[PDB]
Curated annotation (Swiss-Prot):
<protein>
    <recommendedName>
        <fullName>Serine/threonine-protein kinase mTOR</fullName>
    </recommendedName>
</protein>
<comment type="similarity">
    <text>Belongs to the PI3/PI4-kinase family.</text>
</comment>
<feature type="repeat" description="HEAT 5">
    <location>
        <begin position="140"/>
        <end position="170"/>
    </location>
</feature>
<comment type="function">
    <text>Serine/threonine protein kinase which is a central regulator of cellular metabolism, growth and survival in response to hormones, growth factors, nutrients, energy and stress signals. MTOR directly or indirectly regulates the phosphorylation of at least 800 proteins. Functions as part of 2 structurally and functionally distinct signaling complexes mTORC1 and mTORC2 (mTOR complex 1 and 2).</text>
</comment>
<comment type="subunit">
    <text>Part of the mechanistic target of rapamycin complex 1 (mTORC1) which contains MTOR, MLST8 and RPTOR. The mTORC1 complex is a 1 Md obligate dimer of two stoichiometric heterotetramers with overall dimensions of 290 A x 210 A x 135 A. It has a rhomboid shape and a central cavity, the dimeric interfaces are formed by interlocking interactions between the two MTOR and the two RPTOR subunits.</text>
</comment>
<feature type="repeat" description="HEAT 3">
    <location>
        <begin position="65"/>
        <end position="102"/>
    </location>
</feature>
<feature type="repeat" description="HEAT 1">
    <location>
        <begin position="1"/>
        <end position="31"/>
    </location>
</feature>
<feature type="repeat" description="HEAT 2">
    <location>
        <begin position="32"/>
        <end position="64"/>
    </location>
</feature>
<feature type="repeat" description="HEAT 4">
    <location>
        <begin position="103"/>
        <end position="139"/>
    </location>
</feature>
Length: 170
């Protein structure tokens, strides 16, 4: 059980990734937890696409209410610190999908992310706009708590000397 999952995670991390995620989601729903968490943490720490895909595939299938949300919050902030390549940008989508599950700590995570994104707002301002957009798309209600600070931060980031930074802010 755990041996197959560990082998599949490594192969997907390094259509192979899509096939592994689909098989893992079906196997997890049909059916241990500690082995999956350790394998996911190693993949996320190391690679980047496989770890986020495995977490996203496991999200909404295992049924984590608060325990899984808290663990993913620490990993979400790790990828937010650095604006990695376009392949690793899927981490924000996985975080947004998890935050849209409707958990008790989802509102707290959204509020914390919004405050963190305001400070970040070009490896910081551009990534914050994409992160804020992902949070806003998943939770439009939570994105209206502080819209005035976001508008002021977006205006300053839009004037930065870049090309794709303004596209994300717009």
């Amino acid at each position: 059980s755990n041996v197959s999952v560990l082998q599949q995670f490594a192969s997907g991390l390094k259509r192979a990734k899509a096939a592994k995620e689909l098989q893992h989601y079906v196997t997890m729903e049909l059916r241990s937890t500690r082995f999956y968490d350790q394998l996911n943490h190693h993949i996320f720490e190391l690679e980047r696409k496989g770890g986020i895909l495995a977490i996203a595939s496991l999200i909404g299938v295992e049924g984590g209410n608060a325990t899984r949300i808290g663990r993913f919050a620490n990993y979400l902030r790790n990828l937010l610190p650095s604006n990695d390549p376009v392949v690793m940008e899927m981490a924000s989508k996985a975080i947004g999908r998890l935050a849209m599950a409707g958990d008790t700590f989802t509102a707290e995570y959204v509020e914390f992310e919004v405050k963190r994104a305001l400070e970040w707002l070009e490896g910081r301002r551009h990534a914050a706009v994409l992160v804020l957009r992902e949070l806003a798309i998943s939770v439009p209600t939570f994105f209206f708590q502080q819209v005035q600070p976001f508008f002021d931060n977006i205006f300053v980031a839009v004037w930065d000397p870049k090309q794709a930074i303004r596209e994300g802010a717009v």
